[PDB]
Design a protein around this ligand. Structure first.
Ligand SMILES: O=C1Cc2cc(CCN3CCN(c4nsc5ccccc45)CC3)c(Cl)cc2N1
Length: 540
């Protein structure tokens, strides 16, 4: 089964979202708070999720039959997936346009004489926005020059609408009949991305002036580590790239067997994730160093720090290889495959999580997938407009920020403190052949929550306004973003209150029906609750 651990560790979050986060934070100084969070609270909250899903064969919302008070955490990890699906599909819509626009002998992003070119373009033969490759993305693809801000936003663009419809149709017809959407599409996302990355890495070392871009990647500065921004960016990116906190792992583990080894599958994914991220950063910074001996400017003053860094970088590196059309086609085919697989995984996670709860949607899958996909298309229509990059930035900043860390922290607290690390270890020993040990028990009970809470608190206290590289957002945009962020975090206490007023009895007999497994129904009456003695809470 050593193909899924290779075909799933890389997705559209290590080749798109990691480059610009590494570039913005400096490069190198971003890998110190990345490995720490991967070792401390990235592997344990992958092993725990896999074990929970494999033992309790339920989705991401009804798995909380071991502690009914915490069922709101299951509902709080579906809205985040919905938002991520919206802007994920919007972003995938660009790769189709770039692939279709590359079936020529002279690529559009190499010349400075096309219709969409302003009378300020400069051909070398904050950010410089007049370069031929960065002007294409801004004008002939996004049409950003017709929007004055987030308060203007024109009508949707008719050229990306067709690509969005194509992506929506592909997703629907992929997830319309069966859950097995992984046994025939893992032979393109497991081999091609590695080949393309290797070619790019082996080419980006002979470029003139490419040593100055790798002498800054392997150079640690100690003044960016005293500010609480990289510590939050790395913490969010770890959970974005690993899959924890979205409910995907539980849903995809509930369909496996009862003798699978989660230990090996958890230790064989983080290593590949780290290696892929390091290699991607190396290649990206090599290309950035190359694009400084041409414009004769500094490394920090080239390119953007937004979502278009890869679309500005990679087309400017394909043009140097011999046979540019072939490599462009291969690269964008790989991007399309990665995006489609990730979107399919997320949508399947949402659908399974919602269908395991209500049994009426389990018999109607074609009428439910259509509804989910149509809602996603309608709510993703916003980012296709003229000023859609502003909405994309707002969603990227606020959809999964503090909310995902809060959800993961609540998951860890509910699984450990209120259930029992002893009970979890006994279940794992019943399923597999061994016991979790001591490192994982000490990590999942004391160390991981102590870091997640610190990150959440320091992110709440140290909040900075929202900008896009030249544009300070209006003040009400921050209010809207915080409302979006709180829309997921507010679901945890609401379910607690509802379940407290829903049951019948006294306070002692109402608090005792939400801290015990649902199958131990005839134990509360005989006053047999193990959570009322210190021996349960004194077990490390
Ligand atoms: O068994 C298994 C299954 C499995 C899947 C994965 C991929 C993790 N990725 C998936 C996409 N991600 C989304 N979260 S929400 C959302 C909404 C729309 C589109 C994408 C998304 C981010 C995390 C990994 Cl790395 C290991 C394993 N192991």
């Amino acid at each position: 089964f050593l193909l899924s651990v290779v075909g799933f560790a890389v997705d559209l979050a290590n080749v798109w979202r990691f480059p610009y986060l590494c570039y913005k934070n400096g490069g190198g100084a971003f890998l110190i708070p990345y490995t720490l969070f991967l070792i401390i609270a990235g592997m344990p909250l992958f092993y725990m999720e896999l074990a929970l899903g494999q033992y309790n064969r339920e989705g991401a919302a009804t798995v909380w039959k071991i502690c009914p008070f915490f069922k709101g955490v299951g509902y709080a990890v579906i809205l985040i997936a919905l938002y991520v699906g919206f802007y994920y599909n919007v972003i995938i819509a660009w790769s189709l346009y770039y692939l279709f626009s590359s079936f020529t002998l002279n690529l559009p992003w190499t010349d400075c004489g096309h219709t969409w070119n302003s009378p300020n373009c400069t051909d070398p033969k904050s950010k410089y926005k007049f370069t031929p490759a960065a002007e294409f993305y801004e004008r002939g693809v996004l049409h950003l020059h017709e929007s004055s801000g987030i308060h203007d936003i024109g009508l949707p663009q008719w050229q990306l609408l067709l690509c969005l419809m194509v992506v929506v149709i592909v997703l629907y017809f992929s997830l319309w009949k069966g859950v097995k959407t992984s046994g025939k599409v893992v032979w393109i996302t497991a081999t091609l991305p590695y080949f393309v990355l290797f070619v790019l890495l082996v080419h980006g070392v002979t470029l003139p002036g490419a040593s100055n871009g790798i002498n800054a990647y392997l150079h640690i500065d100690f003044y960016r580590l005293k500010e609480a921004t990289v510590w939050i960016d790395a913490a969010t990116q770890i959970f974005f790239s690993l899959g924890a906190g979205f409910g995907v792992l539980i849903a995809f583990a509930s369909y496996n067997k009862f003798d699978n080894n989660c230990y090996r599958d958890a230790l064989l994914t983080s290593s590949i994730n780290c290696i892929t991220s390091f290699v991607s950063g190396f290649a990206i910074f090599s290309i950035l160093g190359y694009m400084a001996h041409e414009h004769k400017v500094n490394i920090e003053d080239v390119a953007t720090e937004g979502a278009g860094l890869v679309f500005i970088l990679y087309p400017e590196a394909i043009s140097t290889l011999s046979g540019s059309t072939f490599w462009a086609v291969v690269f964008f085919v790989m991007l399309l495959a990665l995006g489609l697989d990730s979107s399919m995984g997320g949508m399947e996670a949402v659908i399974t999580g919602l269908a395991d709860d209500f049994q009426v949607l389990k018999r109607h899958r074609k009428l439910f997938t259509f509804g989910v996909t149509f809602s996603t298309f309608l709510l993703a229509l916003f980012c296709i407009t003229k000023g859609g990059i502003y909405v994309l930035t707002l969603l990227d900043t606020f959809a999964a920020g503090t909310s995902i860390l809060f959800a993961v922290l609540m998951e860890a607290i509910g699984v450990s403190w209120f259930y029992g690390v002893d009970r979890f270890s006994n279940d794992i020993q019943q399923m597999m052949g061994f016991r979790p040990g001591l490192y994982w028990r000490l990590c999942w009970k004391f160390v991981s929550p102590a870091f997640l809470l610190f990150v959440v608190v320091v992110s709440i206290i140290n909040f900075k306004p929202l900008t896009y590289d030249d544009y300070i957002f209006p003040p009400w945009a921050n209010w809207v973003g915080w409302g979006i962020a709180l829309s997921s975090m507010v679901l945890v206490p609401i379910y607690v209150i509802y379940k407290f007023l829903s049951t019948q009895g006294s306070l002692w007999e109402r608090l005792a029906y939400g801290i015990t497994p649902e199958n131990e129904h005839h134990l509360v009456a005989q006053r047999d609750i193990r959570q009322f003695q210190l021996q349960h809470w004194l077990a490390i």
